[PDB]
Amino acid sequence: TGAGTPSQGKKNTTTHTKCRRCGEKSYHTKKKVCSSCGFGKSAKRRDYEWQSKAGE
């Protein structure tokens, strides 16, 4: 079975959804964790220094 187009047909599973805390469609309803703000994993807000250039 082709890994491309033919394998795209079984994709009717809902995972990432609108997050209660940040509003982004990143709340993974299976994991109950937002990949954008960290809701469900961290009280503190998700954020990293690599999200911007080193000297900025």
Binding site for RNA (CB under 7 A): 44, 48-50, 54
User: Does the CA dihedral 33-19-37-8 come out positive or negative?
Assistant: positive
CB 3 to Mg ion: min, Å: 5
Q: 20 and 39 in contact (C-beta within 8 Å)?
A: yes
Binding flags for Mg ion, 2-31, as an x/- string (CB under 5 A): -x----------------------------
Shortest distance, position 24 Cβ to Mg ion, whole Å? 27
CA 33 to chain centre: 8
